[PDB]
Amino acid sequence: GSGVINYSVLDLTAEELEAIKHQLNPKDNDVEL
């Protein structure tokens, strides 16, 4: 019954947003959704 974190951000940075789009150097090594 692990809790879930609420991540709701709109004011994202260009450098941050671009980083996700590229998905370069990920962190999730196992169990990905």
UniProtKB/Swiss-Prot annotation:
How is the protein altered post-translationally, as described in the entry? Tyrosine phosphorylation modulates viral transcription and replication.
Q: Which cell locations does it reside in?
A: Virion; Host cytoplasm
Quaternary structure, per UniProt, is: Homomultimerizes to form the nucleocapsid. Binds to viral genomic RNA. Interacts (via N-terminus) with the phosphoprotein P (via C-terminus); the phosphorylated phosphoprotein P binds to N-RNA complex. When in a monomeric RNA-free form, interacts with the phosphoprotein (via N-terminus). Interacts with protein M2-1; this interaction allows the association of nucleocapsid with the matrix protein. Interacts with host EIF2AK2/PKR; this interaction inhibits EIF2AK2 phosphorylation of EIF2S1 and blocks EIF2AK2-mediated translation shutoff.
Q: What does this protein do?
A: Encapsidates the viral RNA genome by forming a left-handed helical nucleocapsid that protects the RNA from nucleases. RNA replication depends on the availability of soluble nucleoprotein. The encapsidated genomic RNA is termed the NC and serves as template for transcription and replication. Together with the phosphoprotein, sequesters host NF-kappa-B in inclusion bodies (IBs) thereby inhibiting this host defense pathway. May also act as a modulator of the innate immune response by sequestration of host IFIH1/MDA5 and MAVS into IBs.
UniProt similarity note: Belongs to the paramyxoviruses nucleocapsid family.
Q: What is this protein called?
A: Nucleoprotein
- Which species is the source of this protein? Human respiratory syncytial virus A (strain A2)
